[PDB]
Design a protein around this ligand. Structure first.
Ligand SMILES: [Zn+2]
Lengths: 121, 99, 177, 93, 72, 73, 107, 77, 193
RNA sequence: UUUUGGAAGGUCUUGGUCGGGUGGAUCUUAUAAUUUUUGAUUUA
RNA sequence: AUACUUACCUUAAGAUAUCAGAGGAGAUCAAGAAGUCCUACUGAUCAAACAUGCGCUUCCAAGAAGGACGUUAAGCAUUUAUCAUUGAACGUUCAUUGAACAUUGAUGCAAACUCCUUGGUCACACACACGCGGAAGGCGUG
């Protein structure tokens, strides 16, 4: 997929990436992680869940693989029944764009606190 | 005594005394007298090796690991030498120690 | 310990189940809540796409057509009209079969909204606490309304028409009332 | 305390969620009240057994540690829980 | 830490699905912070029936879910 | 009256029997020591594969996890 | 006394990992979490001779075309069954545990 | 009536010393029948006069510290 | 519907009910780990077929610190067995000695007299020094002539224990090298405050 | 004569224009016992 | 906004680099604890941010990548569309009684069309060898 994932990044740095998290069942969830926690409960935006069927599993044995996708959208997956997560797509907006966006979010937040201080007066 | 009720910083010593004079005295013996033990695991992997460290969780470093299991379909018994291993204690069923 | 309510921008000094339930049912929370969710949707619908539109590089361009701009007052007016009309088209449902089956033997079990058994126990349970001061149900049978055209019902309502094309109707209907 | 995802599950109260269970059952219905321990209570529940049938519970209470995931509605994509920078209005004293 | 919200089901006939095919119907006499559940008049339903004595208590690990058979 | 820790204290120095979770395997030996997490350290144990001995084991250590119960013989 | 700290001394070291599933994983540790969520760049991972759930969990992780070559795999702690260290590494150096030393001086 | 929580119910059930059909976790688990002589918080239950009967000639087992997690279900037979 | 109508109807407008078909996992009856578990007693042969044991050497590295701590404590106890024979201590009454410590270095002995003559006539005074540096160590031993002004010098309200001798607060005790039953100095695990 | 370091000037390129019973984040400890990390998902 | 009333609730703990010395806490007993603790002290390693490079490495225009929760499409091949009791006829068929999604599906094999979203459709040049500013990562220095 030649995506070249950041060699020194873990979960909090992986935010808004498009993941391919894999579970104990062998089902795959694909989508933007928007949040995790201590127990690895993930949210997953626009998520699609794919299985292989039992029948297509025979072809998977030691190729074109009719994976079955249902569309779960905004789901919020659990840390108990997962196995492992990888990264599939990079996010939409680049590091400069994410950086300028975070600057604007912080300026707006400081401004809202100034407005709270004004209404408190 | 209850676990919160012990204190801070007694708790480590109370674990260590539980290690020396508890059920842990087989893994206590095996690390200090370097005798080989035989770990049976949940996935049929018998393991014959010498123990380097202990855990509360029975996370165990193992050195010069023999491991051996059984492919039952007939049977081929397969063995593998793994020299430096770190084994989680969840899989560990029973630690047998030879004299 | 502290439960920050992101909508209310207030705190709960010590989290427990009962102050959470009582806060999330609280009318102040529901009002700021509804304002926020409406607000996020009207922002996302308002927010223009503004794609990059990577312009390619290209004889047969001989025809030239006149663009049509508008005045800034005219822009703001037609945008306001479109806002009101989107808000109508989303909200409006179609009555008809309520007004059609008005006299029916089992209208008052089926369309009267919590006598249906399926959604029925909801609307009793979804009723809000009525702490401030100030139904046609299953009892209705056939012999309640024996003859509907004795006691005059209103006619079937005349169908609705786009005002943009209201000028282009058939003038002078056959058969005056 | 909670952390972001179970706070989201505390947010999506009274709205149409869909749960897979570890058995493969995917309940679906309105979410009466979730707890912090992810025990979730649901209403007007339409259920899919592992065998492929469908039935209708009225009033289910599925335990948290057999939830496979839960799907909330789409709009909570845009939620103030996700805002990384919203500053705190002077915590109580 | 939080005790579960089975207060609405306090006397109403509930149906546990226990473990994956065990289905037990009783009346919810009790609940603790683990969803250990005390049922009265447990009557295990196989798809044949089998009654389960006067009182019973069922492990909150084994319990998957429970339905209110009684109206609320 | 009795709880698992008093029964387990009094269990010490007895030919104990241990059914694991799995019913394939049971260890009959003399109980040496037990923690608060109910880990089991035993001596000169005896295997039973579905009931029949496959050998005498020696001093042995079961994790608290895999054992379904312990009995006094 | 926990041994995850041992693994925390092992950033940029090349191990293999066998999972409770049966998946075998080859590729360096970039870090390790408190409860042993081990993140691993430059993986190629294999499944020895078979488990159908493991077959699905192998293929579906992208770049299968049964060695699957992946840039970056986070692995959850309760999936890691056993982890094979490099034999070049000296265990006498790592198990010394400066925290356990300080605690001996704390006593 | 009132609430009968599980801890207090098993203690009442311990005083009365009535017989117990205790069940187990899955297909391996063998239905034990006994009389409770005591429990704990982790639901490790020392049961007296145990008779194990396979899943559908029950054999005695004596007195047992039964582990907590393997229990599915207590009943009074 | 829920409490407010507008966004519950329009905005949230949730997901389609989702398509189901056949799972891959096992439908509870067979979730098993491994009921066919090993029968270890065969492997008691193969360890003979396994046949030295490598040096542990890390528990040695901790055991060196533990043994050094016990050896330093034992050297302490050897200094504990090894104060009537001592020539610095004068065989006066122990009850008429007052100990002072936390003393400034440049404090002259005549000043020590001057702060101490207020209560009783002083018999003799030994301020303790290093024997190799000859810096004043910071503590001194005073015997008065009576016990009662040693006690009034021990009773401290407005006086000694808290007096600022050469712009520093000092500490003022009865001598416990002779008096109390179990006393060890700082070198010997004891000491006060 | 060469190398290194510091200073100054000129030229080019890129970027910008002390306290706190405060909260949050990370890591330890309760916390290896039924609810996510100390295993009941290689189906025997 | 203010007042009044009611209901509910009021504190898990600790740390924020690590190691070795300088000095302090100038250690309450006859010259000394050991240790442990702190620091605008120093030295070493590590982590984070920022800047700069790497004659770093890779990816950037009818087609290429991804998707269709679209069709052609009942395309073709295969399979399946409850149990129990009683009566009758020669295991089957029919009838009665009691109990509990969908065939145009499902599964496999493809193939084609149409549609969708993204991208430096850059600057230079259009020629016979054996460029700047973008995006993602690695390393180095400060
Ligand atoms: Zn609120």
């Amino acid at each position: 997929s030649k995506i070249q994932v950041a060699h020194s990044s873990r979960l909090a740095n992986l935010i808004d990436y498009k993941l391919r998290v894999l579970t104990q069942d062998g089902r795959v969830y694909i989508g933007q992680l928007m949040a995790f926690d201590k127990h690895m409960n993930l949210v997953l935006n626009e998520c699609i869940e794919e299985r292989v069927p039992k029948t297509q599993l025979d072809k998977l044995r030691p190729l074109n693989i009719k994976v079955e996708k249902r569309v779960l959208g905004l789901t919020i997956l659990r840390g108990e029944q997962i196995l492992s997560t990888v990264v599939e797509d990079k996010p939409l907006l680049s590091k400069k764009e994410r950086l300028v966006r975070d600057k604007k979010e912080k300026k707006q937040a400081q401004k809202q606190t100034k407005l709270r201080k004004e209404k408190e007066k | 005594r209850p676990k919160h009720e012990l204190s801070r910083a007694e708790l480590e010593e109370l674990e260590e005394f539980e290690f020396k004079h508890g059920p842990m005295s087989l893994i206590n013996d095996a690390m200090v007298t370097r005798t080989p033990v035989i770990i049976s695991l949940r996935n049929n992997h018998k393991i014959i090796a010498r123990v380097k460290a202990f855990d509360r969780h029975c996370n165990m470093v193992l050195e010069n690991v023999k491991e051996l299991w059984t492919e039952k379909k007939n049977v081929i018994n397969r063995e593998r030498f793994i020299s430096k291993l770190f084994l989680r204690g969840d899989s560990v069923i029973v630690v047998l120690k030879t004299p | 310990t502290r439960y920050y309510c992101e909508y209310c921008h207030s705190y709960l000094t010590h989290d427990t189940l009962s102050v959470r339930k009582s806060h999330l049912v609280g009318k102040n929370h529901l009002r700021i809540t509804a304002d926020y969710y409406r607000n996020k949707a009207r922002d996302i619908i308002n927010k223009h796409n503004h794609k990059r539109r990577h312009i390619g590089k290209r004889s047969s361009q001989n025809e030239t057509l006149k663009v049509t701009c508008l005045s800034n007052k005219e822009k703001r007016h037609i945008m306001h009209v479109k806002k009101m009309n989107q808000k109508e088209l989303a909200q409006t449902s179609i009555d008809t079969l309520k007004l059609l089956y008005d006299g029916s033997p089992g209208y008052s079990k089926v369309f009267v909204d919590a006598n249906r058994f399926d959604i029925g126990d909801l609307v009793k349970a979804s009723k809000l606490p009525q702490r401030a001061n100030e139904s046609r149900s299953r009892d209705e049978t056939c012999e309640s309304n024996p003859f509907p055209r004795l006691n005059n019902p209103k006619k079937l309502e005349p169908p609705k028409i786009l005002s943009q094309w209201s000028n282009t109707i058939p003038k002078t209907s056959i058969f005056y009332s | 305390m909670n952390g972001i995802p179970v706070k989201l599950l505390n947010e999506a109260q009274g709205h149409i969620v869909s749960l897979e269970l570890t058995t493969g059952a995917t309940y679906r219905g309105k979410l009466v009240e979730s707890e912090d321990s992810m025990n979730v209570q649901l209403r007007d529940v339409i259920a899919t057994e592992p065998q492929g049938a469908v039935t209708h519970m009225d009033q289910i209470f599925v335990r948290g540690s057999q939830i496979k995931f839960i799907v909330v509605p789409d709009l909570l994509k845009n939620a103030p829980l996700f805002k990384k920078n919203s500053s705190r209005p002077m915590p109580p004293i | 830490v939080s005790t579960p919200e089975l207060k609405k089901y306090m006397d109403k006939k509930i149906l546990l699905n226990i473990n994956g095919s065990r289905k037990v119907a009783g009346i919810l006499r009790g609940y603790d912070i683990f969803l250990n559940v005390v049922l009265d008049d447990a009557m295990e339903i196989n798809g044949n029936n089998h009654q389960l004595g006067l009182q019973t208590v069922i492990r909150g690990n084994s319990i998957i879910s429970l339905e209110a058979l009684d109206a609320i | 009256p009795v709880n698992p820790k008093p029964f387990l204290k009094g269990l010490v120095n007895h030919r104990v029997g241990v059914k694991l979770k799995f019913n394939s395997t049971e260890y009959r030996g003399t109980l040496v020591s037990t923690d608060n997490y109910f880990n089991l350290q035993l001596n000169e144990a005896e295997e039973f594969v579905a009931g029949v001995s496959h050998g005498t084991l020696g001093e042995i250590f079961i994790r608290c996890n895999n054992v379904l119960y312990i009995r006094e013989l | 006394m926990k041994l995850v700290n041992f693994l925390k001394k092992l950033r940029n070291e090349q191990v293999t990992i066998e999972l409770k599933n049966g998946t075998t994983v080859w590729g360096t540790l970039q870090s390790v979490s408190p409860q042993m969520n081990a993140i691993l760049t430059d993986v190629k991972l294999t499944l020895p001779q078979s488990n159908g759930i493991a077959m699905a969990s192998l293929y579906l992780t992208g770049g299968q075309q049964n060695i699957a070559s992946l840039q970056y795999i986070n692995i959850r702690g309760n999936t890691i069954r056993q982890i094979i260290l490099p034999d070049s590494l000296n265990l006498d150096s790592l198990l010394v545990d400066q925290k356990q030393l300080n605690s001996l001086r704390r006593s | 009536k009132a609430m009968v929580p599980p801890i207090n119910c098993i203690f009442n059930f311990l005083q009365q010393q009535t017989p117990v059909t205790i069940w187990l976790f899955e297909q391996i688990g063998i239905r034990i029948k006994g009389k409770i002589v005591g429990f704990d918080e982790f639901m490790n239950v020392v049961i007296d006069e145990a008779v194990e009967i396979p899943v559908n000639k029950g054999t005695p087992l004596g007195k047992i510290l039964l582990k907590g997690d393997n229990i599915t279900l207590i009943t009074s037979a | 519907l829920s409490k407010y109508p507008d966004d519950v109807s329009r905005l949230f407008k949730p997901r389609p009910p989702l398509s189901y078909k056949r799972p891959t996992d096992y439908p509870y009856a067979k979730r098993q780990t491994n009921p066919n578990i090993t029968g270890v007693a065969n492997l008691l042969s193969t360890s003979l077929k396994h046949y030295x044991x490598x040096x542990x050497x890390x528990x040695x590295x901790x055991x060196x610190x533990x043994x050094x701590x016990x050896x330093x404590x034992x050297x302490x106890x050897x200094x504990x067995x090894x104060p009537n024979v001592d020539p610095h201590i004068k065989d006066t009454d122990p009850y008429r000695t007052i100990f002072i410590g936390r003393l400034p270095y440049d404090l002259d002995e005549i000043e020590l007299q001057k702060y101490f003559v207020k209560f009783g006539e002083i018999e003799k005074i030994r301020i303790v020094k290093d024997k190799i540096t000859q810096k004043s160590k910071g503590y001194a031993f005073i015997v008065f002539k009576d016990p009662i002004s040693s006690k009034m010098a021990f009773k401290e309200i407005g006086v000694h224990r808290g007096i600022q001798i050469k712009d520093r607060i000092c500490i003022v005790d009865i001598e416990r090298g002779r008096t109390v039953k179990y006393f060890k100095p700082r070198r010997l695990g004891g000491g006060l405050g």
